């Protein structure tokens with residue numbers, strides 16, 4: 064069973080918090096979600112988990128410095144990465160996330176919110 | 189004269205675009221300011237590897253700015269982040285918590301003083 068790291072906006076805004084809870088609930092079916100002192104403790108503890116993770120899953124619809132930073136560190140750690148983006152939000156996903164995808168180790172999937180459990184099923188089965 | 193890489197929100201929102209222009213204008217006094225989205229990512233990743241200092245205005249939340257800062261840390265780059273409390277926001281723990289006060293600095297500042305702050309950092 065893989066160790067999993069979930070990323071989603073917090074101080075960038077909690078608009079998608081209920082969706083994040085759905086994603087984490089589904090990820091727990093497959094493995095251990097590691098992400099579930101001030102800000103330094105948060106950074107250091109999360110960097111520890113990010114190196115431990117087998118897969119990094121990020122919901123990248125809501126813009127967030129912390130999510131982007133986690134993804135940048137994860138790429139440099141050579142982590143397998145799954146990013147999930149909702150075009151129906153009306154946003155354009157950052158070129159630094161869209162353009163980081165190599166289609167294998169770093170995947171970016173566009174999706175509709177109702178399908179997120181099914182999409183995670185497809186990725187983790 | 190350093191090679192300088194500037195970061196500021198675009199697709200996260202262009203609210204601070206005028207301020208970014210002021211920062212880049214002042215940075216040029218101190219050094220060189222360096223398909224599809226893949227070309228942008230690859231181009232900018234090359235510049236960021238070529239940089240001596242990465243300067244980021246981190247007030248507007250942005251995936252791309254955060255990603256640039258994460259890649260910059262792993263590229264062992266010198267980093268200066270600039271945050272405005274007048275925005276009313278609480279800056280990301282990942283940026284505030286990455287700071288070490290030396291090679292990764294996070295400064296709170298008021299918009300009117302950004303040129304003086306840059307003058308101080310770049311001597």
Ligand SMILES: O=c1[nH]cc(CN2C[C@H](COP(=O)(O)O)[C@@H](O)C2)cc1CO
Nearest residue numbers: 070071072073074075127129130280281
């Ligand atoms: O309270 C927190 N708990 C845990 C974290 C670590 N990551 C960052 C990212 C949100 O980044 P952001 O939107 O907050 O910038 C999430 O994936 C969790 C950050 C904070 C506050 O930053």
Ligand SMILES: O=c1[nH]cc(CN2C[C@H](COP(=O)(O)O)[C@@H](O)C2)cc1CO
Nearest residue numbers: 157158195196197198199200250252253
């Ligand atoms: O058009 C572009 N030109 C150049 C870039 C590279 N960086 C990312 C960051 C903004 O990131 P973001 O807010 O767009 O996510 C800026 O520092 C420039 C990204 C885009 C569109 O993403």
